[PDB]
Design a protein around this ligand. Structure first.
Ligand SMILES: [Cl-]
Lengths: 153, 112, 152, 154, 112, 107, 156, 154, 150, 106, 112
């Protein structure tokens, strides 16, 4: 360690060895978590009140979606000390299969990424969480395909 | 759930008085900058209810709840009433809303 | 209790705005302070410096027609130095590959677009986030469509 | 005219429109920046000083018809550092633009796919960042700010 | 439209003088560092035209316009000509371009 | 015309009450869909004045006039206040505005 | 204190330029003597045809400048159509005008030039066609008075 | 004698050529119409029924040489309505025929500049449309249908 | 199924120094009885029509004296078989200042005419200009001509 | 870009076969009323290419594309070839063209 | 004539802001040594306007013109205002002047 550098910061990436779950990690190469940011239950805990930049990306992969009725979601939520209800700050939905379902052929690997980012005023003790409804379609194979992070502006 | 309007469905008689209560759950909103809005049955315009006379408002800052007692009820006072509040913390300024429907019936005016 | 900061803005789509994109600031988890003004659906930079501009839109439709809709979303800039609308960020997305479902109707589709970048803005510059089809907006749930700038 | 000085390492490079089958990054164009020490060498950004940076890039893919079998669109921002001289992926995304529908006696139709990547990272002096795609033949830089790549020292 | 090259399509005969004018619309670009590029028909080279002799360059800062007069025109001077200017405000430094093509026919050379 | 603000320039002291009158001249605009907007002196953030509390609105359908009483004037209640109305006849529907400046001096 | 019992018609639109739109051409419909009714919708500064049929397209713009410091300025005005059958911008009506033919106000100034441009024609449009009226230099617009810049269609 | 009936409020009036320096609208000329209720009062057209109308007019200005630098020719179609009794412009155009010049050493330079206006509007009963110009001393109503003005109920 | 006679013809761009009207072009109409005979539109039914035409003039310099650009729509009727002008306009493009041994300055001047008239069966309309050497048919919809029975 | 002729400039050898493809983008144009026209190098007169024998035309209504394969190539075939189609929707009837030049050496 | 003041006579009201512009005609005078002078109505001494606060000075180097915007107008700021510039070529040093008069009217006059 040479130069100090500061601000609450976090850039966590999904655990590749979790398969059917999205577990956030910080001890893996180009990942960061320092200066007060806590990771409790896959939740980032704000250490100080101020303006933050919140972002997250998720990559979905399925092997030839046979079901027209497929819905993929990705949302970053906030539970604050002032108002103790989970509300979505950033949200996105994506329909991966436009009915087109493989009939007389073989599998069709589809990939769908979703990216979210925004600036918010957060308070001390706020709990941020990035979650998806289909954690069985997670593709954490490669490296920077799924992540979640904040930086104090 | 960010202000809670309690009386959802009401059915009162012409000549009564309904009181509607709203409770603040966001600790940044104040009971001082409160507003009330009604939507008369059949119209799509949200009108601004006035503070005075037949519409009396009781506020208690301790529990972060305010109420609105309405007297002399007729049959033209059937509509959706919502409550509002002004919140302010850091660089943020926002407001909150509710929901609730009113239905008023008549007395038939017995003719001898 | 905690002191303000620097020019910031995070505006959200109006949920009760019938088929149109009106940006709002006085709603939960939204900001517009430290000089940034929202004029006629436009953000006005109050001071010279480097800003980070971003916006997301969610498009939803209840079926794939034959028209072949093209979804666009661009953040453009009108500067005091060059009084022409020029695009800073843009993206295009085609939602319908389907050969118009003739028996399996409805089937709601969802398509998002996200834009973000760093730019140098001048005093009085007007940024505008716009889309070509404001009739496919999904402003139903909170924070699905938004637009913001922050002075870095 | 002159108002405020401004500072910190920043870069926002945009693809060259007069390039064919290539993603060549340019800095000397209208709303593009490359100042405060950031160097653009071999289609690569060279970090001039250690700190926390914000990295982002967008790519727009377009084709006028659906091709055969499955084509995969890739977009990755990589980093080769002085500390570890091997290129590792910081951000990645994959996207399938053509879902079956291999045109066999049917009309062609132009498809568009954007891909965006962004995150905060700690970079050192002399690190070489590069944003690249696997099929530079589907690039749609026919309009402005549709493909770009940038960093800013926070 | 960030500098506007005005004579888009011009057609002159061997032995002439064509003027190509460009006017700046970006208030950050300066008339001091101007460059001209010609691309000979059929090749993609865009070599840089030099300021001197057959290529005379007139600059006027008041109307923010520059021109490039080409005299003694031959048939080897037919191509797409661009004008350029160097812009710089804060931390940003860029240049701007235009467009305009020339076609030159000969004189038939009447043999006695 | 197209709505006429009557008190054009007023100068009152902190702690008082000014009334602004607007009169409809278009027989298609209604005194029912009236709106108010304020612009604080030296700032172009024209906001929508809310009808309630210190801001009371009186409508008289007979004379086609609406007014806006402002109570407890402060030193920050100095600006330019405009009125608005929604008009509708056949296939056309539009709105109309006025103009008039307020300056409050503090004691 | 009056009465109204007026009928309606067929797809029509007559929109007027925004006066408070700094150096830009924003089309408005909620202003006196302007129309946008019977299905014609205004999306992204574009009119969307609500039904297939025979239409009359017209538009005028007024250009004003406060001096002629360039004998090489071009003013153009075009009504273009991007159709559902052919998703490409094609010009229906176009006009070009050179506002400054003289050798610039080299001495005194204050010579405001005014040059108007008008377009009109009848066309067959389909449902969902998006019409757009545009100019090349939106910095010379004279929207100071009323009915100086406008754009409209009417279903014949 | 007459033939097929035809209807709708219609008007196409032409300037009086024999009016020297003024704009008098006429209907009793070959290709001019004024029928089905349209009244021309004090050089004003009065709408006979509520509905949508098409308004158009052309004016041709001619001068023999340019006297003033500050010469502005205007042409507007105005409307004073029963609901709002103030004359407002529906269509307007301004034109400067002379860019400085002011011929000192010359032999007179006749200039011709036309102006055309058109639009569709909703009019009410009793509304008065009026076509007016600021300088009726430059009107060129010589050869033919060079100056005209009309409405038609669409 | 749209009735009413209509026509909207546009100039031929590959026509050497002439104003030739075309109807089998992208955004052009000629239907419900209006025929284009000898470069003239023939009205098929008696009624009220809207007549319009625009012409765009372009030149690469101001030659000697003044050029007069005229644009006129004429009508030759069965009742009175002489060509008479329904709409006319004149424009002088050159404000003197003929190029004094310097370089050119391309001028553009368009002219538009429109109005409502009563036409009878067999009337022949023609939109015409005096200088077909200044026609700018380079782009589309710069010169056109049409009628519609309202 | 209403009809899209694909092989813009081709240079073939005597005795081969060039295929020129045109794809309709106006959904009002029909693959049934297709026409071909040639401009022989040095002459400025167009002519109607005949469908038969050495000029074979393949049309596919599904893909809205038609092509013209010319076999047994000679040196008198160097010229600019255009394709055409007759479109008809409502009250409109028009035609569309393209462009593409061929050079054959011996 | 060297230096041309554009606003000759102005009559603004109390509480407003006037800008007076001057244009240089001699190519020996510089927009760098520009000065402004006011002469209060009723007195003879011409005072030197100090650029700061209410007196802001703008410059445009392309056309060699400078202006002076005065904000927060009072009624005691009525007078004859002149602009000045310093010219210097070879063995010569001189200055140039203009002219432009201000009348500012006040308020009240509440006609009852
Ligand atoms: Cl009536």
């Amino acid at each position: 360690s040479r130069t100090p550098s500061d601000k609450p910061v976090a850039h966590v990436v999904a655990n590749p060895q979790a398969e059917g779950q999205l577990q956030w990690l910080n001890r893996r190469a180009n990942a960061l978590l320092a200066n007060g940011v806590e990771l409790r239950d896959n939740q980032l805990v704000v250490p100080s009140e101020g303006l933050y930049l919140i972002y997250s990306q998720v990559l979905f992969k399925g092997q030839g979606c046979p079901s027209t009725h497929v819905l993929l979601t990705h949302t970053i939520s906030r539970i604050a000390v002032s108002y103790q209800t989970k509300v979505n700050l950033l949200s996105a939905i994506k329909s991966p299969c436009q009915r087109e379902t493989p009939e007389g052929a073989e599998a069709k690997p589809w990939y769908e990424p979703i990216y979210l980012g925004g600036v918010f005023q957060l308070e001390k003790g706020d709990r941020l969480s990035a979650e998806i409804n289909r954690p069985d379609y997670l593709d954490f194979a490669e490296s920077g395909q799924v992540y979640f992070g904040i930086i104090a502006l | 759930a960010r202000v809670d309007q309690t009386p959802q469905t009401i059915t009162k008689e012409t000549g009564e008085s309904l009181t509607i209560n709203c409770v603040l759950r966001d600790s940044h909103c104040a009971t001082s900058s409160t507003y009330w809005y009604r939507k008369k049955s059949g119209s799509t315009n949200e009108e601004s209810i006035s503070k005075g006379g037949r519409y009396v408002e009781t506020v208690n800052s301790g529990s972060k709840s305010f109420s609105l007692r309405i007297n002399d009820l007729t049959v033209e006072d059937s509509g959706t009433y919502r409550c509002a509040s002004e919140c302010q913390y850091g660089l943020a300024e926002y407001d909150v809303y509710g929901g609730g429907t009113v239905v008023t019936v008549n007395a038939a005016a017995h003719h001898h």
